[PDB]
Structure formats: C-alpha cells, structure tokens
Amino acid sequence: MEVRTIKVFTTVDNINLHTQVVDMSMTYGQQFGPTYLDGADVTKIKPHNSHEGKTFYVLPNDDTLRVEAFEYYHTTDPSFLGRYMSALNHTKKWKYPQVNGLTSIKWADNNSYLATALLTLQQIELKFNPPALQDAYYRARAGEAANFCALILAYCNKTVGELGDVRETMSYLFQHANLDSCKRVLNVVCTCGQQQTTLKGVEAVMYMGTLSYEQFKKGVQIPCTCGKQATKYLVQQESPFVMMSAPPAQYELKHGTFTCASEYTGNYQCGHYKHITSKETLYCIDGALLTKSSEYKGPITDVFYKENSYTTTIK
Numbered sequence: 529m530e531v532r533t534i535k536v537f538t539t540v541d542n543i544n545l546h547t548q549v550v551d552m553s554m555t556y557g558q559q560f561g562p563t564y565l566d567g568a569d570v571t572k573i574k575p576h577n578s579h580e581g582k583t584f585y586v587l588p589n590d591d592t593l594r595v596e597a598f599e600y601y602h603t604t605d606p607s608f609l610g611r612y613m614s615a616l617n618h619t620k621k622w623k624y625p626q627v628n629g630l631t632s633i634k635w636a637d638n639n640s641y642l643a644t645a646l647l648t649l650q651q652i653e654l655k656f657n658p659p660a661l662q663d664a665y666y667r668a669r670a671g672e673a674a675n676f677c678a679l680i681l682a683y684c685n686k687t688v689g690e691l692g693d694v695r696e697t698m699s700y701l702f703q704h705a706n707l708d709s710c711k712r713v714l715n716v717v718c719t720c721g722q723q724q725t726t727l728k729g730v731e732a733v734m735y736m737g738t739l740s741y742e743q744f745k746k747g748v749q750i751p752c753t754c755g756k757q758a759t760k761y762l763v764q765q766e767s768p769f770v771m772m773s774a775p776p777a778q779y780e781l782k783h784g785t786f787t788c789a790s791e792y793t794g795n796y797q798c799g800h801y802k803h804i805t806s807k808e809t810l811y812c813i814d815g816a817l818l819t820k821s822s823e824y825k826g827p828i829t830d831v832f833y834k835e836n837s838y839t840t841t842i843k
C-alpha cells in the first residue's frame with residue numbers, strides 16, 4: 529500500500545539505455561507494454577528487488593525507440609523484437625563448442641541448419657550492414673553466438689525448434705550483407721536465338737539446380753527443351769564466394785576444390801544437416817561432433833566455393 533518504486537532502463541538495442549521509474553504494484557505489462565529480461569517475458573512479472581539498475585528490452589512504442597530499432601536492426605517488422613527475445617531465451621542455453629577452430633552449435637531444438645549456416649558464415653568473406661549483425665557476428669566468432677543465433681531466427685522468421693532450410697536462411701543473411709560489388713553474367717545455348725541475363729547482388733552468388741561450379745562454367749542442360757533442350761553457362765563472375773544449391777542428391781566432395789558444403793538426410797518433414805569443410809583433409813562437423821576422411825560421398829544440398837574473378841572463354 530505504500531508507494532515503492534525501482535529504477536530500471538529500457539532499450540531496443542541493448543546499447544542506448546533509457547531511465548524509467550517503475551512501480552512494484554504494477555506489472556512490467558502495465559508500464560512498458562511487452563517487456564523482456566534476457567529473453568524472458570516480464571510482461572507480467574512485477575518489478576523485483578533484484579531488477580534495479582538492469583536493462584529491459586521493450587517494443588518500439590514511441591518514436592525514438594522506432595529510430596533506434598531501425599538503425600540497429602534494419603527492419604520495421606512489428607514483431608521482430610519479441611521474435612528476438614523468445615528465441616534469445618532458448619539460444620542462451622545452447623552451447624557453442626570450438627570445433628576445429630570454428631564456433632558450431634551443439635544439437636538442440638533442430639538447430640542443425642543454424643550450426644551449418646554459422647560454420648559457413650565463418651569460412652566465407654562477407655560484411656553485414658545491420659550494426660546488430662556486426663556486433664552479434666563479432667561475438668559469435670568469439671564463441672558467444674547466442675545473440676547471433678536468436679537474430680537469424682528473428683530475421684528469417686523461424687522460431688526455436690521450427691523446420692529449417694540452409695539455402696533460405698542464407699538468402700535472408702545475404703539480404704542484410706553488403707554484396708553490391710557482386711556480379712554474375714549468364715547465357716543460353718542451343719537453335720532458337722540466344723538470350724542473356726546478368727544477375728547482381730544476392731542473385732549473383734546464388735544458383736539453384738547444380739552443386740558443381742565447374743559444371744556451371746562448362747554448362748548445364750536445363751528445362752528449356754524450347755527445341756533441343758538448352759544449356760546454361762556462366763560468362764562472368766565478380767564475387768568473393770559463390771553458393772551452388774540443389775535438391776538433396778548423392779555427391780562426392782573432393783578435398784581442396786571447394787571450401788565448405790551442406791549435407792542433408794531425411795525428408796521435407798524432418799531431417800538433419802551436417803557441414804563439411806575442406807582443410808588439410810575433409811572435416812565433417814555435426815553440432816558438437818567432428819569426424820574426418822580423405823574423401824566424402826553423401827547427400828549434398830549446397831556447396832560453397834572461393835571466388836574473386838572468373839571470365840569465361842567457353843565460346
């Protein structure tokens with residue numbers, strides 16, 4: 529019945545802080561709308577003794593807080609934060625082992641496709657532009673990837689334990705990186721004329737249909753029997769990596785010719801990714817798990833290869 533307040537801080541970036549005076553009769557709800565402490569919803573938990581001086585993430589309710597979230601996260605999605613928080617709240621009790629000098633995640637909540645994305649992020653050259661991703665990535669490379677993993681989940685709109693694709697995942701991660709200088713040129717072969725595309729940005733590091741890069745630049749028969757069934761070949765690449773992608777098929781991975789690749793077992797209704805990286809030998813990372821051999825054969829879905837500048841000569 530006596531008035532008893534604490535002092536806390538709100539935030540949508542965890543950096544710019546904001547002094548509030550909070551009442552211990554009233555929920556966090558009734559003051560700041562939805563409020564989170566480290567992933568946990570306090571929207572209902574009344575202001576405790578132990579919460580004084582501590583930072584609560586809120587929802588961009590005012591305008592300053594719109595400006596901060598935008599500048600931090602590059603998105604105005606009405607539920608982004610809550611999506612971050614729900615997921616932060618799982619991913620902080622995930623473990624993140626050093627495996628062969630890279631940060632991976634231990635299997636939890638069907639994070640297989642995340643472990644593999646993470647391991648790929650750390651072997652390819654790419655710069656995120658959302659400060660939020662720059663910070664969390666930096667921490668992730670340091671083995672505290674909890675923040676990082678909750679954001680991916682946030683930015684791809686997957687919730688913890690939800691069915692997950694690596695190709696799409698990385699699309700979403702490509703959207704928010706700087707991949708401008710990225711240029712690809714393509715032409716079509718065989719009867720009936722000949723018509724050229726040249727792709728840019730994400731569209732220029734990503735190809736669906738074949739895992740083999742060499743097979744891209746030699747050509748592929750593609751669905752396009754316009755009268756002979758045409759072949760697709762790369763003419764120019766300008767990009768620091770490339771990402772080839774197909775339906776899961778059995779594929780042999782040859783030391784020293786690619787950088788890293790993604791394997792998948794199961795159907796479209798459950799399954800598991802592993803990651804294969806090419807060092808002094810071939811390393812197969814499965815969450816906390818690490819095997820090796822000289823050769824690999826298996827169900828491959830995406831492969832990554834080192835790039836700078838290829839110009840065709842094939843015609």
Ligand SMILES: C[C@H](CCC(=O)O)[C@H]1CC[C@H]2[C@@H]3CC[C@@H]4C[C@H](O)CC[C@]4(C)[C@H]3CC[C@]12C
Nearest residue numbers: 601602603656657658702703704705706707708
């Ligand atoms: C890396 C991503 C783009 C790819 C690149 O830059 O290579 C990022 C970086 C800069 C970002 C955009 C900046 C603000 C924009 C305001 C507009 O009112 C709507 C959002 C707007 C388009 C953002 C979203 C996409 C961007 C997130």
Ligand SMILES: C[C@H](CCC(=O)O)[C@H]1CC[C@H]2[C@@H]3CC[C@@H]4C[C@H](O)CC[C@]4(C)[C@H]3CC[C@]12C
Nearest residue numbers: 638690691692792793794795796797798799800
């Ligand atoms: C919705 C479910 C998915 C969950 C799960 O995969 O555990 C079930 C319902 C019907 C099932 C399909 C029925 C036909 C086939 C039978 C064969 O024994 C296995 C493959 C087969 C294509 C099934 C795949 C799994 C399905 C789609």
Ligand SMILES: C[C@H](CCC(=O)O)[C@H]1CC[C@H]2[C@@H]3CC[C@@H]4C[C@H](O)CC[C@]4(C)[C@H]3CC[C@]12C
Nearest residue numbers: 740741742785786832833834835836837838839
């Ligand atoms: C001018 C470029 C070299 C720049 C440099 O010296 O840093 C050229 C010359 C040698 C080429 C590489 C050889 C084929 C490889 C295929 C593999 O699937 C992945 C690409 C791979 C590594 C190519 C990258 C582009 C290269 C074309």
Ligand code: NA
Nearest residue numbers: 834835836837
């Ligand atoms: Na290269």
